[PDB]
Amino acid sequence: GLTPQELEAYGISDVHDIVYNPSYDLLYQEELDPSLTGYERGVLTNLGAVAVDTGIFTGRSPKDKYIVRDDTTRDTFWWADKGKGKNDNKPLSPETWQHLKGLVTRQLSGKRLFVVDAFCGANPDTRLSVRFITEVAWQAHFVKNMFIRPSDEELAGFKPDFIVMNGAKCTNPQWKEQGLNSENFVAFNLTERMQLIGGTWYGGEMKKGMFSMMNYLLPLKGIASMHCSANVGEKGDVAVFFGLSGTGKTTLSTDPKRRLIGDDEHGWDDDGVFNFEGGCYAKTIKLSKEAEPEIYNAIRRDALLENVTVREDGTIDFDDGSKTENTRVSYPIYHIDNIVKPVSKAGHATKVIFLTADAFGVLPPVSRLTADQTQYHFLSGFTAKLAGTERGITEPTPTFSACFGAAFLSLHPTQYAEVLVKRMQAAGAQAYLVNTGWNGTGKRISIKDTRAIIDAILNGSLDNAETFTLPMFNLAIPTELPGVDTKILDPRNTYASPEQWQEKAETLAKLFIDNFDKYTDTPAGAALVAAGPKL
Ligand SMILES: Nc1ncnc2c1ncn2[C@@H]1O[C@H](COP(=O)(O)OP(=O)(O)OP(=O)(O)O)[C@@H](O)[C@H]1O
Numbered sequence: 001g002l003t004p005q006e007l008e009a010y011g012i013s014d015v016h017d018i019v020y021n022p023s024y025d026l027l028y029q030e031e032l033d034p035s036l037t038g039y040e041r042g043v044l045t046n047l048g049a050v051a052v053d054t055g056i057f058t059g060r061s062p063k064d065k066y067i068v069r070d071d072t073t074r075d076t077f078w079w080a081d082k083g084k085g086k087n088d089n090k091p092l093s094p095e096t097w098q099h100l101k102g103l104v105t106r107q108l109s110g111k112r113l114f115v116v117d118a119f120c121g122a123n124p125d126t127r128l129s130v131r132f133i134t135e136v137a138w139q140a141h142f143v144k145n146m147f148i149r150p151s152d153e154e155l156a157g158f159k160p161d162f163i164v165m166n167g168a169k170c171t172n173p174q175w176k177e178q179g180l181n182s183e184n185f186v187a188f189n190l191t192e193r194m195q196l197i198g199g200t201w202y203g204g205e206m207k208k209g210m211f212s213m214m215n216y217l218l219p220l221k222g223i224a225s226m227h228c229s230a231n232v233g234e235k236g237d238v239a240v241f242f243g244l245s246g247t248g249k250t251t252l253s254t255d256p257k258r259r260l261i262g263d264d265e266h267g268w269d270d271d272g273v274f275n276f277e278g279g280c281y282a283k284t285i286k287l288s289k290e291a292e293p294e295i296y297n298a299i300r301r302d303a304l305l306e307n308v309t310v311r312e313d314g315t316i317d318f319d320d321g322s323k324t325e326n327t328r329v330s331y332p333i334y335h336i337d338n339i340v341k342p343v344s345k346a347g348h349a350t351k352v353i354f355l356t357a358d359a360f361g362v363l364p365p366v367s368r369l370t371a372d373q374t375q376y377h378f379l380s381g382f383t384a385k386l387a388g389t390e391r392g393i394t395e396p397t398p399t400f401s402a403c404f405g406a407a408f409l410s411l412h413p414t415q416y417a418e419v420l421v422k423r424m425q426a427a428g429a430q431a432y433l434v435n436t437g438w439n440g441t442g443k444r445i446s447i448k449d450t451r452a453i454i455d456a457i458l459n460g461s462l463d464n465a466e467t468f469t470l471p472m473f474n475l476a477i478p479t480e481l482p483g484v485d486t487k488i489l490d491p492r493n494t495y496a497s498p499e500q501w502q503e504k505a506e507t508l509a510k511l512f513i514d515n516f517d518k519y520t521d522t523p524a525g526a527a528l529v530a531a532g533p534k535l
């Protein structure tokens with residue numbers, strides 16, 4: 001536990017009521033207190049899970065992310081202003097940090113506080129011991145779900161080496177004079193080992209905040225830090241699935257035929273692949289119980305639904321994106337029946353899958369990548385969206401995000417590439433590119449087809465298939481696969497002619513080529529251009 005004096009040491013004063021390590025039962029009763037006002041309020045759904053609204057923010061706010069630039073971070077951090085590529089690592093002064101810390105600590109002073117101690121990282125040797133402090137019960141619940149829950153023995157010996165202070169209810173009145181983006185802030189200090197949050201209530205800031213810290217500390221010790229889901233077969237064969245948001249990492253790793261290691265954040269050290277987290281954070285927009293039975297089944301007491309529409313009768317309309325398209329549910333990982341336990345880790349990955357949702361409808365559902373293509377596509381980090389849907393238009397809009405997670409990278413993309421390649425080479429890993437997005441039908445590839453494709457990757461069916469080369473992107477693709485619609489395997493088949501596919505392929509190829517140009521200032525980078533699409 002901790003005393004009011006211990007909180008005083010952090011700068012938080014006059015705390016009279018302290019809830020240390022709140023139980024799931026307490027969090028349930030706290031959320032449902034009928035006297036709660038505003039965004040703290042929870043409502044009970046017919047599935048038995050509590051639902052909350054996360055307020056004005058229903059996703060992360062990268063424009064409000066700052067890292068204190070000091071002698072510890074100056075020469076290692078991938079800074080937004082250093083001329084080494086676009087990122088969100090905006091530099092913050094130590095003086096401005098102290099002002100933000102004053103805002104948050106005063107906001108939390110004189111309040112009833114939840115204190116949640118948890119781990120980030122499955123392995124004792126590299127895990128962070130994180131202490132989270134909040135005045136909002138559902139925020140405490142989110143962290144209880146998403147981080148690793150210590151045992152009673154671990155709690156007795158708990159020594160934090162990172163503090164996360166959530167001051168969602170405060171804002172920064174001096175932001176203009178400080179040169180910041182807004183009155184909100186998500187700030188990190190690697191000297192004081194602390195994260196401060198102001199203005200946004202969104203729980204993902206804590207989750208991805210700690211991921212950003214692991215992404216800083218682990219590769220500097222030779223450990224890959226990866227934006228991927230992961231699972232393992234009965235024989236100990238491990239797969240990792242990289243991809244940007246909405247590409248299928250959580251959906252596809254939750255597979256009845258595999259033991260789930262984790263759905264979002266993993267390390268890769270000398271012993272194998274390990275989860276940083278204690279829970280999963282599923283997307284619920286248009287959720288289908290038939291299509292995603294395990295994720296659906298995880299929505300029960302102790303899960304926490306976010307921003308969903310709950311009807312008067314307590315039923316949920318999963319199709320309603322009126323609050324946000326980013327509706328979510330978090331749950332502790334043991335709400336999934338087939339998981340790796342008691343520790344979320346396994347051996348070395350031998351299958352590396354890059355998921356992408358191609359709104360341009362160009363990329364094949366599945367292709368086997370060469371070693372050089374693996375590096376090219378990892379640095380590229382492509383996905384796309386139909387941005388114009390609400391206006392009745394396509395407007396395919398590309399996103400290139402290095403390492404399939406540039407928003408969370410604390411070091412240069414090439415540092416993540418180097419250590420991933422080292423780990424893959426040692427393991428004899430093979431890499432694959434999977435389009436979970438669109439084809440010439442203007443519809444997304446079915447979850448059924450995609451799962452069958454993943455099965456074929458994992459069981460060696462794809463590796464043994466007759467393949468040919470798709471032009472332009474030069475991707476090795478199969479003629480047929482068990483349980484997969486044969487028609488979809490060649491992306492040209494869903495257009496009126498290959499020439500109509502090619503028009504779109506040329507557009508997309510040019511986007512890749514222009515994006516990759518920034519990596520060609522080194523000889524290694526320049527040499528990968530040949531592995532990219534070619535007009
Ligand atoms: N063929 C498909 N494969 C995977 N997901 C699909 C497919 N078709 C539709 N979807 C939908 O796409 C979304 C995939 O979301 P998921 O939560 O798996 O993304 P994620 O990669 O985990 O994102 P994040 O990084 O934000 O956690 C879900 O809404 C899912 O129902």
Ligand SMILES: [Cl-]
Pocket residue numbers: 243244245404405407
């Ligand atoms: Cl992302």
Ligand SMILES: [Mg+2]
Pocket residue numbers: 249250251263264281282283
């Ligand atoms: Mg996910």
